[PDB]
């Protein structure tokens, strides 16, 4: 029993997608199903309902921009999304009401992002120091997500944080990466933070010191 | 339209305790729609609780909705590991609508933060851009507050911040709070500060450079 | 300024499929849009009407199993058809509408098939004669359209006769295609019809005498 | 809802004469919503009025609208050959509907038509089924009646017709019928007769052929 979704990508505002919900397990044309988003950190947000017998429903933050379809044999529900904006980027699920009995099925659900970014590169500053101390590795001005940050290639890895991304004012995102040593082990240790950013096809290891 | 509060933001104990969520409607409310979900970071919600009061098959035994009308109670007996995530609720009328969230937290001893503050790189000094990072290492509780201070003037709405999930060895929280300015604007003061202000400091710490000092 | 439909095949009783409709001089999303069949050898009939303002309406022979819908970003509309029945089998176009100064716009359409048929190959059976004298070919028995019957291999054609195929009762197609010659070239000219049916990769050619 | 009639359903004219196309509405009817559409065998259909007695552009003097209330008429002040297709017109509500559709034909002499019957093929009598064949070549009008004569049995229910598009030379149409028997109640009988009647012939004329004779 599974509901498996498609279709999520990078949409210029302005510009349309078409989400896929594949299913098996329940069949979609019988029951109740739901499209509901989450922006990232945010909550649940609930966006279209369709009936058994077709009858549709929609929140009002989308009306008129999205259309919710299936299709019997293919076992597949659609969400038809137009005009897209900058707010409807979320992570997009697909379920299965059961009205009183509650959403009993779920899918992990597609990612999309909607920016009239660009791709750039993430440029990687160090963080350099001068009991403990701490050093680490600023990853800024790249997207859309992600990057994976590693220190010293994989080997160390106690003390390190990784903070999530903020989107800065020109679209654009940033995160830290730290780590905290022995304020000894400064002149003996050698400190390369790894950074990868596969949509830019950038890859980088500066040393900080 | 039917609106769902959830209190309170963030709900703060430890394994073993007994867990108390409130759901909130905004007008009477029937009781056959209002089902609990369980959401881990990074997956789908569970159905826990439908109706007001009915476990979903496979929730055990440590999961009971209650209430009616306008306030419903989800509660947790004896709280385990796995227990801890968001919880949200549900109540449909002519279409679902769901709360804003509750969140689950491990309460620890109260450990001060780990307090660092760095200069721009000397690379991004020459982009035109200066980022001043301020580190707050493993702190508890998360609740704390960042200070820019430069040249003894509040700095106010140019600076963000992130924070961790909490840490799953020592359950303590991180955080990031970045200062953005002009290279120009940079170079027109001397002493960046960063003042931060926890429930394990005693004083508020500041640590502090000054501009071009090696 | 076209209207091009894509998407039509054969679908099974029961089945679904889903009609594109890729626009250029017109942008679907701020005109009323349509769609209207035909079924073989009878006359137009409505189908989906779509507003600019996103209100849909359909014929009461299809509503609860069709789904209209459009992509601006594309700039194409579609129609998914869900429980497709055996009378559904026809041509369908896609048009805008002005409702006051009518439909100025059509496309060539694309052809649905729905039976519970498979894609055999045709039997060719010959017709012999005993002032002009008549012979003929049989082309009986296959799924789907169309057969290519021609004489001679294009030689003969003053004369020639291919008739619409007639869908019997077993669900399967038959057509005849004759020629009239003179009655005395019966013993001085040979006659040989040449069949080909694509879809099944059969290739006849069958002497008349 | 609003229900068109056209009439008739087939008209038959020579080119040069006045062609004029009726439309029936089932009820009291805007002029301001009603079209006219030409198709052509094999091609889409082409606006030619709209409202109610407006030329869509690239559409000819010759064509003109009229009417008003429950019936319009369609007008084509002198036919030409491309002229010769069928003719829908249009009404609308809440949603379009069409007419049935007329058929504008050429109208040529009386030609009569020249009639032939096939026997099932040997080859056929090895699959166990019986199509018994009756050809009618080059004939005007498109009028005509195929009988089947079973032993002088009149058959009922187990034939099939279907006619070819008007010649583009001579102006003249052609129909096949087919009669599907099994090689068991092929068997039953001897004489096969294939009776036609048309407006060319004085009397029907009978062509039929006896089973297993050479």
């Known amino acids: 029993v599974q509901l498996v979704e498609s279709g999520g990508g990078l949409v210029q505002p302005g510009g349309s997608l078409r989400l896929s919900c594949a299913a098996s397990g329940i069949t979609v044309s019988s029951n109740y199903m739901n499209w509901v988003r989450q922006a990232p950190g945010k909550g649940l947000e609930w966006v279209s309902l369709i009936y058994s017998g077709g009858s549709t429903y929609y929140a009002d933050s989308v009306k008129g921009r999205f259309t919710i379809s299936r299709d019997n044999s293919k076992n597949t529900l659609y969400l038809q999304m137009n005009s897209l904006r900058a707010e409807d980027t979320a992570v997009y699920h697909c379920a299965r009401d059961l009205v009183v009995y509650g959403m009993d099925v779920w899918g992990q659900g597609t990612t999309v992002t909607v920016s009239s970014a660009s791709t750039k590169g993430p440029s990687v500053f160090p963080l350099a120091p001068s009991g403990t101390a701490a050093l680490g590795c600023l990853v800024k001005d790249y997207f859309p997500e992600p990057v994976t940050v590693s220190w010293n290639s994989g080997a160390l890895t106690s003390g390190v944080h990784t903070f999530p991304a903020v989107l800065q004012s020109s679209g654009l995102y940033s995160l830290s990466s730290v780590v905290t040593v022995p304020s000894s082990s400064l002149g003996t240790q050698t400190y390369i933070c790894n950074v990868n950013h596969k949509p830019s096809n950038t890859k980088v290891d500066k040393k900080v010191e | 339209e039917i609106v769902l509060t959830q209190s309170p933001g963030t709900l703060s104990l430890s394994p073993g305790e007994r867990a108390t969520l409130s759901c909130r409607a905004s007008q009477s409310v029937s009781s056959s729609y209002l089902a609990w979900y369980q959401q881990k970071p990074g997956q789908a919600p569970r159905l826990?609780?439908?109706?007001?009061?009915?476990?979903?098959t496979g929730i055990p035994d440590r999961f009971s909705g209650s209430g009616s009308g306008t306030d419903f109670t989800l509660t947790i007996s004896r709280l385990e590991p796995e227990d801890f995530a968001v919880?949200?609720?549900?109540?449909?009328?002519?279409?679902?609508?769901?709360?804003?969230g509750t969140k689950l937290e491990i309460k620890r001893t109260v450990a001060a933060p780990s307090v660092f503050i760095f200069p721009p790189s000397d690379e991004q000094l020459k982009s035109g851009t200066a980022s001043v990072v301020c580190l707050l290492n493993n702190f508890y509780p998360r609740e704390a507050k960042v200070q820019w201070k430069v040249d003894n003037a509040l700095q106010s709405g140019n600076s963000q911040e992130s924070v961790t999930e909490q840490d799953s060895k020592d359950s303590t929280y991180s955080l990031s709070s970045t200062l953005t300015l002009s290279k120009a604007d940079y170079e027109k003061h001397k002493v960046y500060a960063c003042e931060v202000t926890h429930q394990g400091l005693s004083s508020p710490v500041t640590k502090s450079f000054n501009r071009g000092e090696c | 300024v076209q209207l091009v439909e894509s998407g039509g095949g054969l679908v099974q009783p029961g089945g679904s499929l889903r009609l594109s409709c890729a626009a250029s001089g017109i942008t679907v999303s701020s005109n009323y849009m349509n769609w209207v069949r035909q079924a073989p050898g009878k006359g137009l009939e409505w189908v989906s009407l779509i507003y600019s303002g996103g209100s849909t309406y359909y014929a009461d022979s299809v509503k609860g199993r069709f789904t209209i819908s459009r992509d601006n970003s594309k700039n194409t509309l579609y129609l998914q058809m869900n429980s497709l029945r055996a009378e559904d089998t026809a041509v369908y176009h896609c048009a805008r509408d002005l409702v006051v100064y009518g439909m100025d716009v059509w496309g060539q359409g694309t052809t649905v098939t729905v039976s519970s048929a498979s894609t055999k190959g045709p039997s060719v059976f010959p017709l012999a004669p005993s002032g002009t004298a008549a012979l003929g070919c049989l082309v009986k028995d296959y799924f789907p359209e169309p057969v290519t019957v021609s004489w001679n291999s294009g030689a003969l054609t003053s004369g020639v006769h291919t008739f619409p195929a007639v869908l019997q009762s077993s669900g399967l197609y038959s057509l005849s295609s004759v020629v009239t010659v003179p009655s005395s070239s019966l013993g001085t000219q040979t006659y040989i019809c040449n069949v080909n049916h694509k879809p099944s990769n059969t290739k006849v050619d069958k002497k008349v005498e | 809802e609003i229900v068109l009639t056209q009439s008739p359903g087939t008209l038959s004219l020579s080119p040069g004469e006045r062609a004029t196309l009726s439309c029936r509405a089932s009820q009291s009817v805007s002029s301001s919503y009603l079209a006219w559409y030409q198709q052509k065998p094999g091609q889409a259909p082409r606006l030619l009025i709209y409202?109610?007695?407006s030329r869509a552009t690239g559409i000819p003097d010759r064509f003109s609208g009229s009417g008003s209330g429950t019936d319009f008429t369609l007008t084509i002040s002198r036919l030409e050959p491309e002229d010769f297709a069928v003719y829908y017109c249009?009404?609308?509500?809440?949603?379009?509907?069409f007419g049935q559709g007329t058929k504008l034909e050429i109208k040529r002499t009386v030609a009569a038509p020249s009639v032939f019957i096939f026997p099932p093929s040997d080859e056929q009598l090895k699959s166990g089924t019986a199509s018994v064949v009756c050809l009618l070549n080059n004939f005007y009008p498109r009028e005509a009646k195929v009988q089947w004569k079973v032993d002088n049995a009149l058959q009922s229910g187990n034939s099939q017709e279907s006619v070819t598009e008007q010649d583009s030379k001579d102006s003249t149409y052609s129909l096949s019928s087919t009669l599907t028997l099994s090689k068991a109640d092929y068997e039953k009988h001897k004489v096969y007769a294939c009776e036609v009647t048309h407006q060319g012939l004085s009397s029907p004329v009978t062509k039929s052929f006896n089973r297993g004779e050479c």
């Open positions: 409202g109610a007695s």
């Open positions: 249009q009404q609308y509500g809440s949603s379009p509907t």
